[PDB]
């Protein structure tokens, strides 16, 4: 029952058990029917929490591997564990990315849903890029760029400049430029124009998404001040 699987997901969510949470919404998405947006948000929170625990473990151990410049035994042990963590992290990214390609993107029937899922696709290829080395990596980076860019095009055309989702896309696309592509000037100008454009149309804010928009505008500006440091 789509509604049971969704009620368990919310339960999992309150128990802080995000892998269970993510498994519910996974099989929900596989029923092949368009997600409602309470549903889409449950999916997105779940996998963001599940992949985020891996990303954070990856950074810790990847750092230990750099601080153990041989020190060969410790560095080998750190490398191994890093790679064990990477492989959980790739499985999670691939899982999400086939949900996007097989169900969510093809079924997105409104512009805001397409931008949301193309951004999400940009996001998971970015998490794979954070962690790819060598041959893989250019292909992976291209795909992330291409998903954000498509998203970015649709959102400039369809959504108001203060829409949380358009603002979040500019935030993430700009983080992609700075962090994955090492192009800080391009990151700064993407973030600065997304901020300035939302300030020009503060009248487009609505009661129910006000908070998220205002929070993302603040995050835009904090990256900029950080990147200009």
């Amino acid at each position: 029952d789509k509604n049971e699987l969704v009620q368990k997901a919310k339960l999992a969510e309150q128990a802080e058990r995000y892998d269970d949470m993510a498994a519910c919404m996974k099989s929900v998405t596989e029923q092949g029917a368009e997600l409602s947006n309470e549903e889409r948000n449950l999916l997105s929170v779940a996998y963001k929490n599940v992949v985020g625990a891996r990303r954070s473990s990856w950074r810790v151990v990847s750092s230990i591997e750099q601080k153990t410049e041989g020190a060969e035994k410790k560095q080998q042990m750190a490398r191994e564990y890093r790679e064990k963590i990477e492989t959980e992290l790739r499985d999670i990214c691939n899982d999400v990315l086939s949900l996007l390609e097989k169900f969510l993107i093809p079924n997105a029937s409104q512009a805001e849903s397409k931008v949301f899922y193309l951004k999400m696709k940009g996001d998971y290829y970015r998490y794979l890029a954070e962690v790819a080395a060598g041959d893989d990596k250019k292909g992976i980076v291209d795909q992330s760029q291409q998903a954000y860019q498509e998203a970015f095009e649709i959102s400039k055309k369809e959504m108001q400049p203060t829409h949380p989702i358009r603002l979040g896309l500019a935030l993430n696309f700009s983080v992609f430029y700075y962090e994955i592509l090492n192009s800080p000037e391009k990151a700064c100008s993407l973030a600065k124009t997304a901020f300035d454009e939302a300030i020009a149309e503060l009248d487009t804010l609505s009661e129910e998404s006000y908070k998220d928009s205002t929070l993302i505008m603040q995050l835009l500006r904090d990256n900029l001040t950080l990147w200009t440091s």
Binding site: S44, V45, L171, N172, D212, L215, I216, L219, D222, L226
Partner: peptide, 9 residues
């Protein structure tokens, strides 16, 4: 470390 879009949520 740059900040990306958090959960709503």
């Amino acid at each position: 470390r740059s900040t990306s879009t958090p959960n709503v949520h």
